[PDB]
């Protein structure tokens, strides 16, 4: 028969998806491709490049700022940005602040059709006379591209950042034996998806399944 | 008669054993962990399945 599909969601960041019963072997036959896709192919956004005014390179330290440049770049990797305009392929975010203030995400200058999902995200703490002037480059992409691999520079002194595009943070799947009547060898698929909230776990799965179906159509025309 | 046994009795047996445990023993029983209790999971096949952690 046709498997029953079961959803358990927590907010926008987590979901568990159970498909049972399946014929023997099909749990891993479905689970592995979906996991590969869910990690590699799900469209998302990432910080690809950063300019900080008086900072020459990635390991420099900023006078008047507690965090070093490395730590600021790290915090930027954690920024979750959602593009509302389907055609928008990239954006530059600007931040300038100084004096005694803890700079959060909200402080970034609002840009049209760009939603900052986690505005309370810490970026840096600034002391008296500390000055933070920076531009961050946010691109649309999929998967994970290391900084040294994309090598994007808007200008000199722009520092390329390992680009974490994937809205999917983790995928775990477990297949376990199950029985319908007399047949005990059937499969039960439990799929666990963690996203950053821009794409929902249920959304991501549907996107993953869609990609695979489309790829199945590629066996049509010789 | 084994050919007279239908499929509802297997479901009934699952109900019977629900929450119950059995004792597994292996000789020589050198110390008290030679017997331990397990909740049985019914399986096709004629072999008893033992958990790796208790083998020692």
């Amino acid at each position: 028969k046709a498997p029953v599909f079961t959803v358990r969601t927590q907010g926008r960041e987590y979901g568990e998806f159970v498909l049972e019963p399946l014929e023997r072997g099909f749990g891993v036959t479905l689970g592995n491709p979906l996991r590969r896709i869910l990690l590699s192919s799900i469209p998302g956004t990432a910080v690809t490049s950063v300019y900080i005014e008086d900072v020459l390179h990635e390991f420099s330290t900023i006078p008047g700022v507690k965090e070093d440049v490395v730590e600021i770049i790290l915090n930027l990797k954690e920024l979750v940005v959602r593009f509302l305009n389907p055609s928008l392929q990239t954006v530059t975010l600007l931040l300038k602040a100084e004096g005694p203030k803890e700079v959060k995400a909200r402080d970034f200058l609002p840009v049209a059709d760009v939603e900052i999902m986690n505005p309370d995200l810490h970026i840096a703490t600034l002391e008296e006379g500390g000055r933070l002037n920076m531009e961050v480059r946010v691109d649309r992409g999929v998967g994970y591209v290391p900084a040294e691999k994309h090598g994007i520079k808007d200008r000199i002194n722009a520092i390329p950042v390992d680009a974490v595009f994937s809205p999917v943070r983790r995928v775990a799947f477990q297949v376990e034996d199950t029985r319908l009547g007399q047949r005990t060898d059937l499969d039960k698929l439990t799929l666990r998806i963690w996203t950053d909230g821009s794409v929902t776990p249920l959304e991501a799965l549907n996107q993953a399944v869609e990609i695979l179906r489309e790829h199945l159509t590629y066996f049509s025309n010789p | 008669r084994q050919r007279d046994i239908k499929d509802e009795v297997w479901d009934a047996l699952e109900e019977v054993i629900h929450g119950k445990v059995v004792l597994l023993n292996r000789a020589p029983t050198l110390h008290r962990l030679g017997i331990q209790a397990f909740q049985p999971v019914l399986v096709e096949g004629q072999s008893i399945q033992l958990h790796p952690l208790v083998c020692e």
């Binding site: 023997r24 | 084994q2 050919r3 072999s47």
Partner: protein, 146 residues
């Protein structure tokens, strides 16, 4: 008649029959030891109006867990040419039951070097580790045994 289906005229299971646990191999009756039926049986017999038979069912059946195909039967009576049994035995029946045994979980394998183990899992061919050219392996042996 369901129970007697595979027995011949004389009560021996027919060659080629599939026998499973509980099945009759050779039918036999024995005279009931003299006993007075309990008042419950007196009343039960009276209610249903059926005489209690003089004989009891002593038939040889397939033991638990055994069975197969009947490939041979030998029957030896008393007073037939060439055969004389031990005193008191009227007739002896032997039933030879054969089985084709496939390898299964719990069966024991070994090589000539002292590697021995019981089969714990039978995987479908698609789960088996395989060579680049598509050939699946047969057996997976743990290196921790060496």
């Amino acid at each position: 008649e369901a129970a007697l289906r595979d027995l011949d005229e004389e009560g021996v299971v027919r060659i080629g029959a599939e026998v499973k646990p509980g099945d009759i191999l050779v039918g036999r009756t024995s005279f009931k030891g003299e006993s007075e039926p309990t008042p419950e049986e007196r009343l039960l017999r009276s209610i249903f109006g059926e005489k209690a038979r003089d004989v009891k069912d002593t038939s040889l059946r397939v033991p638990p867990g055994e069975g197969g195909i009947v490939v041979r039967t030998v029957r030896l009576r008393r007073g037939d040419p060439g055969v004389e049994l031990k005193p008191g035995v009227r007739e002896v029946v032997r039933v030879y039951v054969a089985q084709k045994r496939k390898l299964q979980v719990g069966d024991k394998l070994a090589n000539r070097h002292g590697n021995k183990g019981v089969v714990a899992k039978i995987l479908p061919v698609e789960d088996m580790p395989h060579l680049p050219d598509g050939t699946p392996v047969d057996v997976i042996l743990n290196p921790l045994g060496v």
